[PDB]
Design a protein around this ligand. Structure first.
Ligand SMILES: CCC(C)(C)c1ccc(S(=O)(=O)N[C@@H](Cc2ccccc2)[C@@H](O)Cc2nc(N(C)C)no2)cc1
Ligand SMILES: CCC(C)(C)c1ccc(S(=O)(=O)N[C@@H](Cc2ccccc2)[C@@H](O)Cc2nc(N(C)C)no2)cc1
Length: 277
């Protein structure tokens, strides 16, 4: 079922069988988010999921790649991710092609960059914690105390979350460990994405593109309110296919919208099966 950070969603047969689909977890989720999609792919398509690991996007990809190669050798690799999962899947594609492997398909499920660039100032840090508090108040129906932003401004990201945690606690909200963990790791995944530089990629990428970011995303980061038609990826990917799916970011992995992703993706997998012969 789960081996290290690999989840089997559908095991491959001992020999032969279709090309496996590798899916990568989003922020604050496991790879069980990909079950609806699995149900929209051909019968007997294997699927394996990469769960969370620590580091820069690059350092995460560096841990996934040894395992991808252990499971699939030379290729063909099919790599899919929703949201952060999409960033991870693409990082892995970069790395696999550089090692001389065969990546046939990268499917970014609404992995869309913020419409504008995020400063790097002490003011932005203050504003981001403000937005996080408003999100946490709405999401958990609690009161978050005002933070003294001096002596937090100067810390790194982990130092910043540690301090906000001590502040929430000292105000008298005891947070379940599971929730502390989840929100810390999600926040740090967001920071990993933001500080990563996207690398050019001369393979085929498919971007499944929703209409907009959902409310909580826009509340957390207002720049998600604006989208480039190419999701920010046209800069880096010469062979980019953009498939419109409608709806919001958060509905992209739910029915009915995942039927569009699944239909399109099935034909891609069909072509790949036709050629392995
Ligand atoms: C559901 C997975 C996924 C990837 C789609 C997701 C993960 C996390 C979030 S969140 O961080 O922005 N909000 C969460 C806040 C929380 C964290 C930890 C413990 C309890 C709660 C929940 O509200 C989310 C959630 N949705 C549901 N539904 C039943 C819709 N349950 O939890 C949003 C979507
Ligand atoms: C830390 C608190 C919380 C729950 C609000 C949060 C914030 C930010 C993220 S995120 O970094 O994973 N943001 C996602 C959009 C979203 C917002 C909000 C919720 C889910 C999802 C995509 O924006 C990622 C993503 N980046 C890209 N790029 C191309 C850079 N593609 O997808 C995740 C949870």
């Amino acid at each position: 079922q789960i081996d290290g950070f690999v989840r089997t969603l559908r095991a491959r047969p001992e020999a032969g069988g279709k090309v496996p689909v590798f899916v990568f977890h989003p922020a604050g989720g496991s790879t069980v988010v990909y079950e609806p999609l699995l149900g929209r792919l051909p019968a007997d398509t294997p699927m394996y999921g990469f769960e969370r690991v620590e580091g820069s996007i690059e350092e995460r990809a560096q841990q996934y790649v040894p395992k991808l190669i252990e499971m699939q050798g030379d290729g063909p690799y099919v790599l899919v991710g929703w949201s952060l999962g999409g960033v991870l899947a693409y990082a892995c594609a970069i790395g696999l092609r550089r090692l001389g492997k065969d990546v046939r398909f990268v499917g970014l499920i609404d992995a869309v960059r913020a419409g504008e660039e995020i400063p790097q100032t002490k003011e932005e840090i203050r504003k981001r914690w403000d937005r996080y508090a408003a999100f946490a108040e709405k999401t958990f129906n609690v009161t978050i105390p005002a933070i003294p932003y001096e002596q937090l401004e100067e810390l790194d990201d982990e130092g910043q979350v540690r301090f906000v945690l001590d502040a929430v606690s000292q105000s008298g909200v005891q947070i379940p460990a599971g929730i502390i963990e989840h929100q810390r790791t999600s926040y740090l995944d967001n920071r990993a994405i933001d500080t990563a530089q996207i690398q050019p990629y001369d393979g085929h990428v498919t971007l499944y593109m929703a209409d907009r970011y959902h409310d909580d995303a826009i509340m957390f980061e207002p720049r998600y309110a604006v989208r480039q038609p190419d999701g920010g990826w046209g800069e880096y990917v010469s062979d980019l296919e953009v498939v419109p799916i409608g709806g919001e970011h958060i509905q992209a992995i739910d029915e009915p919208i995942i039927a569009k992703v699944g239909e399109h993706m099935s034909r891609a997998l069909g072509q790949i099966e036709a050629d392995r012969t």
